[PDB]
Amino acid sequence: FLLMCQQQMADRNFKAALVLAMRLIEYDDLVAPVDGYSLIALTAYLVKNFGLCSKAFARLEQAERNDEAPRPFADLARHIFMTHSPVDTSVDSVPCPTCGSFNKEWAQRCIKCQQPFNTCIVSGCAIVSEDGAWQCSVCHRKALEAVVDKYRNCPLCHTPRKG
């Protein structure tokens, strides 16, 4: 996720950047959370949304307080929280395909029926309909048709299409 999460700013479609960035929470062991939460707060600011940025800044500042025992992320957190309204925007925009419950776009499981969803390999959104789901036969991953039609190769394995 990290590569396209960082280059999504170059791709200028900053909406999918947060969807990518909120997928590495479970991957804090492989990549240190101080690396990812910076990007999470950055893309939260760039789309002018909040709430998740508050959690990211809180974890970052707890890490800083663990470190010192002069930090600028406290300055950034306080400056943004006082110069802007720190309230979470709309985050439930996808319903569960099984029980109809609206869940987070970055949710790995349903909040109601607890059913895992396969996530898109490039946009990061959880797939709800298998009709618009493209399954890779080599790296065994799934993505969305509307984005995978643009890419002639898989983002993971870059498997050529047989013809």
Partner 1 sequence: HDDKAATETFRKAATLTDSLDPLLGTVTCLLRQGDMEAAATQLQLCNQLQPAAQRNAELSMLNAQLRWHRRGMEEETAVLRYLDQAAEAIKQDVKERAGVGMEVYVHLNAPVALAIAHAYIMHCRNEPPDPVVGEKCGRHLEFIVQHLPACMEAQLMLAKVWFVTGEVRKAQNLLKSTLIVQEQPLPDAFLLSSQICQYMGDTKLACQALAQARTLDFSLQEKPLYNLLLGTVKSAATAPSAVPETVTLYLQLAQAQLRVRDVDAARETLTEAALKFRGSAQIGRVIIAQAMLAARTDVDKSIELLRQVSSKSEFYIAAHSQLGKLFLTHKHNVAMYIQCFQEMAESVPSAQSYVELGEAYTTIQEPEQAIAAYEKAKALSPSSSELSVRVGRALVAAHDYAKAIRYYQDALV
Residues at the interface with partner 1 (CB under 8 A): 54-55, 57-59, 61-62, 77-78, 81-82, 86, 111, 114
- Would the annotation count 125 as a binding residue? no
Q: How far apart are CA 6 and CA 4, in angstroms?
A: 5
Does 127 contact Zn ion by CB under 5 A?
A: no
At its nearest, how many Å lie between partner 1 and the CB of residue 52? 9
- List CB contacts of 62: < 8 A, sequence separation 6 or more: none
At its nearest, how many Å lie between partner 1 and the CB of residue 98? 16
Q: Which does 99 bind (CB under 5 to 8 A by kind): Zn ion, partner 1, none?
A: Zn ion
Q: How far apart are CA 126 and CA 107, in angstroms?
A: 7
Q: Which does 142 bind (CB under 5 to 8 A by kind): Zn ion, partner 1, none?
A: none
- Cβ atoms of 22 and 52 closer than 8 Å: yes
CA distances from 90 to 50, 51, 87, 103 (A): 10, 10, 10, 11
- List CB contacts of 25: < 8 A, sequence separation 6 or more: 36
Q: Which does 61 bind (CB under 5 to 8 A by kind): Zn ion, partner 1, none?
A: partner 1
- Cβ atoms of 74 and 63 closer than 8 Å: no
- Would the annotation count 5 as a binding residue? no
Please select the residue that binds Zn ion; options are 27, 112, 130, 153, rule is CB under 5 A.
112
Does 98 contact Zn ion by CB under 5 A?
A: yes
Burial 32-44 (b: 16+ CB within 10 A, else e): ebeebbbbbbbbb
Given the rule CB under 5 A, which of 22-30, 64-72, 93-101, 125-133 is the region that contacts Zn ion?
93-101
Instruction: Name the residues that contact Zn ion, by CB under 5 A.
Output: 96, 98-99, 101, 110, 112-113, 136, 138-139, 154, 156-157
Residues at the binding site are 96, 99, 110, 113, 136, 139, 154, 157
